[PDB]
């Protein structure tokens, strides 16, 4: 769920408020997405978007009427390291991995304020 993703990002980037810093950024960081990523961070979000799309197509995910952003899974942050729980069922585990990968990706790429609240004309 979004609440967990927010926590994961903070786990990797302690100084951030993810739902603010990484929302409405570039062409893919936020709800939906289209076009060519404007930078590596935007690309992290495109990959995350693609991961969610793959998830929704999994047999295990079609069983729950909850979208990836509302589907709660279990994970832990410790020493700024993210660990997806073995107690997660197939769908939740896949989503957890998608979020973990994105959180780590976000923490390894540059952040360009110029792309915050990007004109969707550029997408
Ligand atoms: Ca376009
Ligand atoms: Cl990690």
| Dist. CA 31–CA 42, nearest whole Å | 12
The catalytic position among 21, 39, 42, 48 is 48
Question: Which CATH number is correct for 1-123, 1.10.645.10, 1.20.90.10, 1.20.5.510, 1.10.1200.10?
Answer: 1.20.90.10
Positive or negative CA dihedral for 5, 6, 7, 12?
positive
- Using alpha carbons only, what angle is made at residue 121 by residues 110 and 25, rounded to the nearest 5 degrees? 30
**CB within 8 A of 34, min separation 6: which ones?**
27, 123
80 C-alpha to ligand 2 centroid (Å): 7
19 C-alpha to ligand 2 centroid (Å): 19
**CB within 8 A of 103, min separation 6: which ones?**
5, 8, 9, 11, 12, 13, 82
| Dist. CA 28–CA 48, nearest whole Å | 9
Q: Is 99 a catalytic residue?
A: yes
3-state secondary structure of 83: strand
Q: Is 59 a catalytic residue?
A: no
Resolution in Å, one decimal place? 1.9
Enumerate the domain spans of the chain. 1-123
Q: Which residues surround ligand 1, an ion (CB under 5 A)?
A: 35
């Amino acid at each position: 769920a979004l609440w967990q993703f927010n926590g994961m990002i903070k786990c990797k980037i302690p100084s951030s408020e993810p739902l603010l810093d990484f929302n409405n950024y570039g062409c893919y960081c936020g709800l939906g997405g289209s076009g060519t990523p404007v930078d590596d961070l935007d690309r992290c979000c495109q990959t995350h978007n693609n991961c969610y799309k793959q998830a929704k197509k999994l047999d295990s995910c079609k069983v729950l009427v909850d979208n990836p952003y509302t589907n709660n899974y279990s994970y832990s942050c410790s020493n700024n390291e993210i660990t997806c729980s073995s107690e997660n069922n197939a769908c939740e585990a896949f989503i957890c991995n998608c979020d973990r990968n994105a959180a780590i990706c976000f923490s390894k790429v540059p952040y360009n304020k110029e792309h915050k609240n990007l004109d969707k004309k550029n997408c």
